[PDB]
Structures are given as structure tokens and as C-alpha cells.
Amino acid sequence: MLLEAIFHEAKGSYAYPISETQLRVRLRAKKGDVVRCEVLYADRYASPEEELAHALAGKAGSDERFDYFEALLECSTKRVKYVFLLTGPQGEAVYFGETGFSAERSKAGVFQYAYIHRSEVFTTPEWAKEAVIYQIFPERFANGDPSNDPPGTEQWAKDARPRHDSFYGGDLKGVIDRLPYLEELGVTALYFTPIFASPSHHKYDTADYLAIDPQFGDLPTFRRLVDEAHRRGIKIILDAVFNHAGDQFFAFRDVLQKGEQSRYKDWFFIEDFPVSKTSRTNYETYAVQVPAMPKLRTENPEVKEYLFDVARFWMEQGIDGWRLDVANEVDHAFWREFRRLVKSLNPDALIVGEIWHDASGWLMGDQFDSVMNYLFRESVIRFFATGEIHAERFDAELTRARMLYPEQAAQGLWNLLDSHDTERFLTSCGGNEAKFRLAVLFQMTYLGTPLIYYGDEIGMAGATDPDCRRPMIWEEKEQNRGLFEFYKELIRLRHRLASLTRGNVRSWHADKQANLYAFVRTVQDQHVGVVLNNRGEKQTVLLQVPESGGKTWLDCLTGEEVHGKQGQLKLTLRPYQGMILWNGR
């Protein structure tokens, strides 16, 4: 086999504890290059003559070009050393260790996970493991209070087509008046984009971190919201913009007024004074040349303490976690310490970050709890919506992703289908509900945290920003209640089937030709299989199911009861029809 293609490291996403005494190990090799992977391990101080423990590494998945093996090691000593034994299609065996490769186990060496400290066990809030988040764009969700609408606000109508400078008066009061709705839908948390004192429409340039923007409400209204949401079993998530502030931030305006006399001059990155100019900037900002967004020096103790204080103020109000913006642009020390602050105030506080690239460096367990799973969307958009990729490709994109980070993180990734910065997925589906409904079925049954974008649930459509930010449709007769009930049922199923929230993921079937994909979610002895027929034609498939995994399945969506015969399960799926098979365990 190609040893130069096999990889592993005693850390990161290939070696990490899941418990105080259990070490997980991942090993990858060229697809087809290895057939069996076994792990021999023992305590690091074990006598060189003592016998080693054995652990079989199952094929956890495979992507475009790699094979992935995962095994669980029992380390009662909390210290472990181990070597890999890899067997090829031709029985050729070889040990893989820290030293390298060899036919003799001794010469291969041994990887070592020094010690497993309880504090370094990746731990995330339980309520998040089986949660469903609903993304709220305040300015467009509900106008509960007309008295705070900004001047020039436009009529709230379904036919309205938002313009970049539009206003609709969306506010926190509406979110409250509509809480019965979210509860009915079944969401367990609301994620709000920025809503803090700011002069712009987007509010990404914070002016006052300790205050709700007047057009949205006030502390009183916010406290009311949090309280009314909680008694409804709904957590609250706010957006944290700590990378940069607005040009009206008290600390910045002082520097604009006092130049080097400002006690806050080092709260930013300035090249020379005076500090200011239009189309030109003598201080670092978000992206390139954005005057309204002066970068904050999160490395500075003053800045750090201040934001940490800002977090305390809002955590005092009862929020349940944060969504970090441009998180990847603030120092790690800051994030490490922030989590400590946050987790000590609330062990169940969530920390979700937004990185548009491999976020492993932030997802080891000492910083964020998870991040937005943009990969999920990319694979989902192209699979159900544009159809640029087929089922076998879709399977790969997904798998490659799962093995990207530790399970504690993969399990909590926010899987969104769109956002306030993208065209609505229904539109991406060219308006076809058959395609949209299928995707949502997948979103609601896959590994991670489903993130619902306001309105998608009743079938709102629209191009990218700002057309995706159309005012929420509240007239029941103008809403797609058929769709609305679909989301409800999917959400209800996801709540009862433990496998769907806390189960692993395994690919079941991938037909590049028929474009049908299947996977199974597992927890304990329970198994739930999902079959997706992504084609505008009726198709029939043959899935394999050895009696050991059950002999009869019940389609949780239709009640239909199918039986497997001779280790196979015959299934006929209707156009864009999805099936969710439960084995009753």
C-alpha cells in the first residue's frame, strides 16, 4: 500500500479524548489502499514485555480520495501509547507509529497521548446537542411597536421588494408578540444578528455595546423578550462583533477628538494623526478601507477587559450564548479567555463562531463550541438546488467535512441553508418546492444543528441581499402552511429520535447515476436511515440491511412499514421523495 498516503497525529482531529479515560483515534489512507486497521495500545509506562490491548478501527467514512478509520481506546490510566497495524487487500501487514513504518512492530515506534486532563475534554452545552435554531433578522421579522420605526419606513406587505436602504420597523416587540409562533414551530433558540446601538442600517459598526438600538427596543423590552422566550423553552443568542467597532464608539470618537491625547489611542491600529478621511483611512478597519469600522486591539488588556465586561452585561440579562463575527481575526488568547469568562458565568452558554475556512485551530475544545457549517450549505446548494454535483460527490463533500474536526464540534455545527447575505434557498431551488422540501428533510436529519432562516418555513423566496431580507409574511392565508407543517413534523421527529440529535453518521448508499443518497444515524442500539431520491423521476433502489441491524423499518414520515428480505430492503421512492426509516430501537 502507499504508506506515504497514510496520515495521523496524536492530536487535533485525529487524536482526542471524548471522556476522561477514553481516547478516540482517526487514521486516513488512500481510498482502497487499506482494508483493515487495528490499534494496539497500552499505558506509556507499561513494561516492554507486557501484553498490549487491541482495538478495531472501523471505516468511519471515505471522501473523494481518502479512506477514514476511527477507533476508541480505553485508557484507565489516562496515559496511552499506541501503534497501528494496517493490512492491505493482499494481506500485506505493516505497523504505523511515531517512528514511521516497519514490518516489525517494535521498529514502527508508537504514538503517544501524554495525558488526558479532565479540563481538556471538549464539552458543549447539552441543550445544544438536540437543538434547532431560528435565525432572526430583527428589522424584518415583526414590527411589534410602530413608535420606534425609523423615518421613511415602508408598508409591510407580501408584494413588497426591499431595497438596500429600506426600513420596515422590525423590532424586539414583534418577536415577543410572535413567540407563540416560534414555539409552535418547535425552535429551541433564536439567533439575532446585530442589535446594539448603531447609526447604520446593518448595525455592524457598533456605537454603544451596552445598549439596544432605539429602533429595536430597550433593555426593558429585551429583558422581557428573554424572559418570555425562556418560559417557552427558547434560548437567546446574540451576535458579537468584537473584531471591530463603529466610528461612533466612545473610545474612537475620543481619539478623533483628542488624537494622541486620547487615553484610547491604543485601542485601535492607527498609522498617523489626525485620524480620519473619506475613501482613505489612516487606521486599520474591517476588510479594506471601511472608515465606519475601526479595528479593535483585542490584544490590549484594556480592550479585552472592556469587551469581557460587555459580555458580562448581556449575560446578566439572561442570554444563552454568542455568535462571533469575524472571530478568526481576533487573537486566540482572547478567545481562550472569553470562553472561560462565558463558561463560568453559564456552563450552558454557547459559543458559535464564523470562520469561512478550516476552523480546526478554534475547534479543539478551548475556544468555540462550533461554527457555521458553510460547507454544509455548499454541498446542499449544489446537490438539491443547482444539481451541479451528483449523489456520490455529495457523499464525499459531506464526509470530507465530518472528519475535519472533533465530534463534539461536528455534532454542534450550525447547518444553514442560507442567511441574510445569501439568496433564499427556495430561490436557489429556482422556486421548486419539491427540491426545497427534500433538502430541508436532509437538513433536519443530518449531523449538526439545523438553522432555520426566518421565513423559509412558510416558503418565502427571494434573491440575495437585500431581497432575501423581505418582510416576514404573517397573513396566514398568504403563508405556506403545508410547508410550515412539514418543518414541524421534521422538527418533532428530530426531537424524539435520539439518534438524529446525538447519533453518528454513516453512508448507506450513493448512486451517481440515480442520484439517490442514503445515510444512517446511530446512537446506542437505535438506527434511523434516510433515503433521498434527488430526481424528477420515480425510482427504485436496493439497499442492504443484515438482520443484525433489524428486519423491519417504519417510515416515520408515512407510517409505511417495510420488511427486509435476504439482507436487502426494496424501496420505491416517488419524485424528490425522502424516507426516514426507524428500526424501533
In the annotated binding site for substrate, the residues are 244, 323, 420-421, 465, 469
- Hey, is 249 helix, strand or coil? coil
Residue type at position 405: Y
Choosing from 69, 111, 314, 405, the residue that interacts with its own copies (CB under 8 A) is 111
Q: Is 499 left (phi over 0), alpha (psi -120 to 50) or beta?
A: alpha
Residue 148 interacting partner from its own copies, Ca ion, none (CB closer than 5 to 8 Å by kind): Ca ion
Check: CB of residue 85 under 8 Å from CB of residue 57. Answer: no
Residue 328 interacting partner from Ca ion, its own copies, none (CB closer than 5 to 8 Å by kind): its own copies
Query: Alpha-carbon distance 404 to 217, whole Å?
Result: 40
Residue 145 interacting partner from its own copies, Ca ion, none (CB closer than 5 to 8 Å by kind): Ca ion
Please state, in angstroms and as integers, the Cα–Cα distance from residue 340 to each residue in 218, 308, 346, 350, following that order.
28, 10, 10, 12
Please state, in angstroms and as integers, the Cα–Cα distance from residue 321 to each residue in 143, 370, 442, following that order.
25, 12, 26
Residue 325 designated active-site: yes
Check: CB of residue 296 under 8 Å from CB of residue 245. Answer: yes
Choosing from 33, 38, 43, 149, the residue that interacts with Ca ion (CB under 5 A) is 149
CA triple 113-114-119, angle to 5 deg: 90
The site string for Ca ion over 153-192 (x = CB under 5 A, - otherwise) reads: ----------------x-x---------------------
Using rule CB under 5 A, residue 503 touches Ca ion:
no
Residue 302 designated active-site: no
Q: Given the complex with its own copies, which of 299 and 485 has the nearer CB atom?
A: 299
Using rule CB under 8 A, residue 9 touches its own copies:
yes
Choosing from 356, 431, 485, 574, the residue that interacts with its own copies (CB under 8 A) is 356
Among residues 213, 239, 354, 397, the one annotated as catalytic is 354
Choosing from 13, 135, 148, 445, the residue that interacts with Ca ion (CB under 5 A) is 148
Residue 366 interacting partner from its own copies, Ca ion, none (CB closer than 5 to 8 Å by kind): its own copies
The site string for its own copies over 314-343 (x = CB under 8 A, - otherwise) reads: --------------xxxxxx--x-------
How many other C-beta atoms can be found within 10 angstroms of the C-beta atom of residue 415? 22
Query: Alpha-carbon distance 328 to 307, whole Å?
Result: 16
For 64-114, give the DSSP string. SSEEEEEEEEE-TTS-EEEEEEEE-TTS-EEEE-SS-EESSHHHH--EEE-
Cell reading at 254: 475620543
Total residues contacting Ca ion (rule CB under 5 A)?
6
The site string for its own copies over 377-416 (x = CB under 8 A, - otherwise) reads: ----------------------------------------
Using rule CB under 8 A, residue 7 touches its own copies:
yes
Query: Alpha-carbon distance 216 to 138, whole Å?
Result: 7
Residue 30 interacting partner from Ca ion, its own copies, none (CB closer than 5 to 8 Å by kind): its own copies
Torsion sign across C-alpha atoms 282, 256, 218, 470? negative
Among residues 63, 67, 325, 407, the one annotated as catalytic is 325
Query: Alpha-carbon distance 206 to 199, whole Å?
Result: 8
Choosing from 114, 157, 160, 345, the residue that interacts with its own copies (CB under 8 A) is 114
- Give me the residues paired with residue 22 across strands: 74
Active-site residue set: 325, 354
For Ca ion, the binding residues (CB under 5 A) are: 143, 145, 148-149, 169, 171
